[PDB]
Design a protein around this ligand. Structure first.
Ligand SMILES: *C(=O)CCCCCCCCCCC
Lengths: 546, 164
């Protein structure tokens, strides 16, 4: 997901502005749905929501727009148990042997004969929560096992939290409502209001450990690998209690990152750190936020956002619709040099021609250079020390950059990587002169629709994830509900689309109507006022009761 | 009863729900959502109830790409009656009312559905829903950043035998 909130110091109109670009599945239990909710006098909010939820999850109201992105904070901790040496179904806390609890569930199973059989399954639980096994990493042997404590299992406040957000008036009110309830499970919140405040909150449900407990309570080898793992044989490693927290064992709101600015804030699924580089967010719990290198999407956004020039609505829209493959900016110049250095190389000829002719985009008409580049990058990712300039904490926006071609070992391996990528691309069945839009599609009934964008990992702001199915790449997730909100005098102006359309049912008039529009990148008004709604020549109305 | 909503749809089938209270508001939402997505919700509710294997056998998967039986085991564990009860009991009157309206609105569409915008008409798994079903979906989403990402791992967790 991407989110950009612009404030009075940088916006062209001097007011707030928000781009919401969540990246989520195109099917299933997290398929976004547009709706507008009004209880006249006290609730008037529009946006999109997940299936089954009677609240708006990402949206806007008269003076406010907000969105979310999946954060990098931990929302659970693993606990490594020390097992009773006499009994692998018992575990030690402060040297005392405790029994595991056994909870059975029974499931009905439809068999080949069409009849039902009852299957019983035992779930083992510790004081921390259920046991979990990752064969080869988190085993259950005679020495150790792993339990998992999920912080959001006790979060009964989640629905009230969004209903409260739905009622928020401005940025300050939104911040109060979120900090007061702490009902947000696993996302950042970014917002802008009419006044021109830009807000970022890393405000969610996060396991709390007092600072002095972490060194001794962490499992060093696992935390090194980005797993929130704690020592489960020591009662002092229980999540810390703080009366200011809305839920026992979670982090108080005052200890979670918040940035309130009048220029901009952004997030593309990295930590709070470089939300705005002018004001870095640092000194938080490792479970909350760390100073990790940002991904190419955030790096791309910051390269467009930094500076003194005012930001227009159009600017933010085009950051999505340009489909620029920002990872090319770091790699492609030197790759092309490598190409020019190897013109005698027959196996490199087609790849190098395709890369030289490529518009560095994931547009419908973008050349096969994108496909060659994708397969090279997957192999480039696995090479050791191949960056000309590796990541530099002192220069976190401009590194890594370039290929270290001046090192013979690197030059050999990069050329080999390109050779292997080329072979894999050509081993495929992609016809001559095929464009990206000829390959990446969304199936609709017997029909297909060409879809622009590409994987977020290659730094395309318009992130689209797809899987190979027959002769094509089938879109499975990515850009979903799009919302760009400004606040002119008459009322909020919202522009966007729901990329996969309102309905998942092929029989619906709204199964592919916005998907045709997403393909052409033609965003539309999201009508909010009674005037806007009444002006729609498609307007239909039904009143129902029982 | 005491449920009423005014729905306006603009281009692309976007509903604008007006009501005097949360019950009415939920009624509109559930109805409108059912019109576009009855089958999707029914399928995901089956998943969150841990009933995939019952309707579809052990060979299939959920939309999250988990095997039906392991998925069912996880959701039966997650959505136990006592967990649902305690969750409901912690809900404010307003949220309870939103949920009650939603279920009633969804079920109203189901009673009237003639297949116009519903492809799964006549399927045994397309059924009236309860507020508990919406709690099942909510809790499923709640654990997406936690134990949900370890669903297979939870099902796989069994004590060692006699091995070396
Ligand atoms: C990009 O990271 C996608 C962010 C998705 C936002 C979904 C809102 C969270 C709602 C959770 C409901 C329980």
């Amino acid at each position: 997901s991407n989110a950009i909130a612009v404030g009075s110091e940088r916006s062209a109109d001097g007011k707030g502005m928000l781009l919401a670009n969540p990246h989520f599945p195109w099917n299933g239990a997290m398929r976004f749905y547009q709706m507008h909710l009004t209880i006249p006098g006290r609730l008037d909010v529009m946006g999109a929501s997940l299936p089954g939820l009677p609240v708006v999850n990402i949206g806007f109201s008269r003076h406010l727009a907000w969105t979310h992105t999946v954060d990098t904070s931990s929302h659970f901790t693993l606990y490594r148990l020390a097992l009773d040496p006499k009994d692998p179904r018992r575990y030690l806390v402060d040297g005392r042997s405790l029994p595991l609890e056994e909870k059975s569930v029974a499931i009905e199973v439809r068999g080949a004969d069409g009849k039902l059989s009852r299957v019983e399954h035992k779930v083992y639980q510790s004081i921390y929560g259920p046991l979990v096994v990752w064969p080869g990493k988190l085993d259950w042997n005679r020495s150790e096992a792993y339990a998992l404590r999920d912080a959001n299992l006790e979060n009964t406040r989640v629905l009230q939290q969004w209903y409260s957000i739905n009622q928020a008036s401005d940025v300050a009110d939104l911040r109060r409502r979120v900090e007061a309830l702490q009902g947000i499970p696993w996302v950042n919140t970014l917002a802008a209001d009419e006044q021109g405040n830009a807000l970022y909150m890393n405000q969610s449900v996060v396991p709390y450990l007092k600072p002095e407990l972490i060194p001794a309570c962490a499992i060093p080898q696992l935390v090194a690998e980005g797993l929130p793992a704690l020592q489960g044989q020591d009662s002092r490693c229980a999540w810390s209690r703080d009366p200011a927290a809305a839920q026992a064992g979670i982090t108080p709101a005052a200890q979670l990152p918040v940035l309130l600015r009048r220029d901009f804030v952004q997030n593309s699924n990295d930590s709070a750190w470089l939300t705005n580089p002018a004001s870095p967010l640092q000194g938080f719990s490792p479970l909350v936020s760390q100073e990790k290198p940002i991904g190419p999407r955030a790096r791309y956004a910051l390269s467009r956002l930094q500076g003194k020039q005012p930001l227009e609505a159009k600017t933010l829209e085009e950051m999505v619709t340009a489909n620029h493959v920002f990872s090319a900016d770091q790699v492609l110049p030197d790759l092309l040099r490598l190409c020019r250095d190897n013109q005698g190389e027959k196996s490199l000829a087609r790849a190098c021609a395709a890369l030289a002719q490529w518009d560095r985009g994931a547009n419908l008409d973008s050349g096969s250079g994108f496909v060659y580049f994708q397969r090279f990058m997957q192999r480039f990712a696995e090479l050791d020390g191949a960056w000309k300039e590796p990541f530099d904490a002192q220069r976190p926006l401009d590194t890594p950059q370039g290929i270290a071609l001046d090192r013979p070992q690197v030059a050999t391996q990069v050329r080999q990587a390109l050779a292997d990528a080329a072979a894999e691309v050509e081993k495929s069945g992609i016809p001559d002169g095929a464009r990206w839009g000829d390959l990446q599609v969304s199936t609709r009934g017997q029909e297909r629709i060409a879809i622009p964008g590409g994987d977020g990992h290659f730094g395309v702001y318009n992130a689209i994830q797809s899987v190979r199915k027959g002769d094509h790449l089938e879109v499975v997730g990515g850009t979903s509900y799009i919302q760009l909100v400004t606040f002119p005098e008459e009322g909020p102006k919202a522009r966007g689309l729901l990329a996969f359309s309102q309905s998942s049912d092929p029989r619906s008039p709204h199964y592919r109507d916005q998907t045709e529009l997403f393909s052409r990148q033609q965003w539309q008004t999201l009508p909010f006022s009674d005037r806007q709604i009444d002006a729609d020549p498609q307007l239909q109305r039904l009143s129902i009761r029982e | 009863t005491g449920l009423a909503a005014d729905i306006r749809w603009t281009a692309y089938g976007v509903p604008h729900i007006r009501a005097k209270d949360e019950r009415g508001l939920g009624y509109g939402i559930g109805y409108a959502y059912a019109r576009d997505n009855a089958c999707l919700l029914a399928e995901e509710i089956v998943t969150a109830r841990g009933e995939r294997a019952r309707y579809f056998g052990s060979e299939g998967k959920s939309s999250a790409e988990l095997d039906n039986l392991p998925s069912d085991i996880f959701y039966a564990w997650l959505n136990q009656p006592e967990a649902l009860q305690a969750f409901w009991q912690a809900q404010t009157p307003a949220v309870r009312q939103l949920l009650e309206g939603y279920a009633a609105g969804f079920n109203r569409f189901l009673r009237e559905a003639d297949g116009k915008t519903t492809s799964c008409l006549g399927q045994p798994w397309l059924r009236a829903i309860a507020t508990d079903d919406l709690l099942r979906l909510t809790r499923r989403l709640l654990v997406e950043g936690g134990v949900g990402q370890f669903a297979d791992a939870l099902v796989a967790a069994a004590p060692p035998g006699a091995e070396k």
